[PDB]
């Protein structure tokens, strides 16, 4: 059929050829972070990205994640709504992995987090759309497989000089939060009105 | 005795039990050569003998390896 | 491992002899072929003009030379290079056309049987 | 220049400490006038010159 036990949100994750060791570290850290994401092999075409809708329909995932490495020194992340929907391209800088010595946060894999967005996400329209889209993606829907029922971590999204800061924290009993480890500086580049297509509706 | 005369290199290094010379490696077809033995090579290399044919080739090259008889 | 240049004078004279040995073989003709004029591929160097490898198949055809006799009279051919602008084409056509006007081509000996 | 392998061609190692002889390497083997003679040194006869 179209779907058995339809979970509200599912994610599809891909990586392009020529990704770096740290970039592959971040991608592996993410797929562990959201358990409702289906990993997929490399995409051979760094240019014909519009096929991702067909991949999304195949795997029944409505949220597309693509980690494109350019020149083996730039990291970009395309996040889109699989059926029609917006497509937002981000640029990644100042990466941080799980294996870093400084970051000692420890969370349960699949535990449903709490999303805390900076109020600046409600100022501009494109920021409103991005906040809502990121909410529907990072927020693990109820009944997701391999997910944990307990609440243990909080993911924080903040806007600083037009740059999104994403920080995950582990709540300790008493908040006394501890940085989990995923720390990277985000940069919105452009937004497409369609799934990897359509006219550009926002430009940096 | 533990060594006898090797027929190939004429040295009393042919092991009786293993039937193998310790100097050249007889009866192996290839001679025993080891680059860590730099002095070992210069003791038995080319030129340490008559070198009768090589001297003939060296002498015959200048005229173009010709044959026949003069006028 | 240290590389030394004590044979730098020895190398310079050996090449001058090699040029002299070429001229002994082929005396009425230059010891170098005629290279075209091209513009280097960068924003730093595109103002300059240096010598390329050979004349494109369109530069030969426009000048009047065919790609078969070009090598015979000493004109190198570059099948890879192409003419993206009329400036490069007209520049190298005149380089060949000057060459053809300054060239003396000695006739060969043609075999011809008794009948046709 | 001197030969790069001049003075290195012998097979000498220090005879050890505590034998009432200078610890300069001495050529091993036996049965010749050379065995027991010190080598591998600027001060030694038939030894490498200092800073070739």
């Amino acid at each position: 059929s179209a779907g058995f036990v339809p979970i509200k949100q599912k994610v599809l994750v891909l990586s392009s050829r020529g990704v770096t060791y740290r970039q592959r570290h971040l991608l592996n850290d993410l797929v562990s972070m959201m358990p409702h994401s289906k990993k997929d092999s490399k995409l051979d075409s760094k240019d014909r990205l519009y096929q991702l809708n067909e991949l999304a329909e195949l795997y029944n995932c409505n949220n597309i994640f693509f980690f494109e490495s350019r020149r083996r020194e730039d990291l970009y992340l395309h996040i889109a709504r699989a059926p029609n929907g917006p497509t937002v391209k981000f640029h990644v800088e100042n990466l941080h992995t799980m294996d870093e010595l400084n970051m000692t946060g420890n969370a349960l894999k699949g535990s449903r987090p709490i999303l805390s967005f900076d109020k600046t996400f409600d100022t501009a329209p494109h920021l409103k759309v991005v906040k809502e889209l990121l909410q529907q993606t990072f927020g693990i829907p109820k009944g997701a497989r391999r997910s944990k029922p307990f609440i243990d971590r909080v993911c924080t999204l903040t806007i600083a000089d037009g740059k999104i800061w994403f920080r995950n924290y582990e709540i300790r009993e008493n908040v006394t939060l501890i940085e989990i480890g995923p720390r990277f500086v985000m940069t919105i580049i452009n937004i497409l009105e369609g799934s990897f297509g359509g006219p550009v509706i926002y430009k940096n | 005795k533990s060594h006898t005369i090797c027929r190939r290199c004429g040295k009393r290094s042919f092991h009786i039990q293993k039937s193998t010379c310790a100097c050249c490696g007889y009866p192996a077809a290839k001679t025993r050569s080891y680059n860590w033995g730099a002095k070992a090579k210069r003791r038995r290399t080319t030129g340490t003998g008559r070198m009768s044919y090589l001297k003939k080739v060296h002498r015959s090259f200048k005229n173009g390896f010709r044959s026949g008889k003069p006028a | 491992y240290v590389k030394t240049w004590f044979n730098q004078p020895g190398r310079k004279l050996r090449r001058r002899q090699a040029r002299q040995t070429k001229a002994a073989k082929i005396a009425p003709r230059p010891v170098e072929a005629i290279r075209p004029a091209v513009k280097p591929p960068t924003i730093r160097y595109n103002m300059k003009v240096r010598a390329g490898r050979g004349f494109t198949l369109e530069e030969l055809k426009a000048a009047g030379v065919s790609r078969r006799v070009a090598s015979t009279i000493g004109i190198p051919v570059d099948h890879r290079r192409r003419n993206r602008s009329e400036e490069s084409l007209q520049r190298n056509v005149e380089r060949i056309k000057v060459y053809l006007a300054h060239l003396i081509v000695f006739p060969r000996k043609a075999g011809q049987p008794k009948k046709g | 220049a001197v030969s790069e392998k001049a003075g290195h061609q012998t097979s000498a190692e220090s005879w050890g400490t505590g034998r009432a002889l200078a610890r300069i390497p001495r050529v091993g083997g036996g049965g010749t006038h050379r065995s027991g003679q010190a080598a591998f040194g600027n001060m030694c006869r038939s030894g490498r010159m200092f800073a070739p």
Binding site: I114, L115, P125, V129, L133, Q135 | - | - | -
Partner: protein, 115 residues
Amino acid sequence: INNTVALENIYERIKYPDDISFVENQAVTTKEPIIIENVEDDLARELAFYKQGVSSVKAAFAKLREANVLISRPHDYFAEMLKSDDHMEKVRQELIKEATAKKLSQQAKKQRELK
């Protein structure tokens, strides 16, 4: 080009209903618009981020308290975690070395005055 009308239409089309319970969404928007002007001073922004997270955690806990959802994780929970247990041993060793370095520095400082 930054079409607010188009963005608003897309936002309305993909808007999550407000009637959705906080349990289903688990997304909290801070009422206080926390602003960190000192972008260069990351230490100052860290306190602001912690305060925003603490406020969000308190709001979520109060909202989820009426939902009868176990916020606390029992000590008997031994499921698979995001951070590998093998990696935790290396993390503990690194923290132990850093703690020992601070202890040695304090001991040396006390020894300097003692001598």
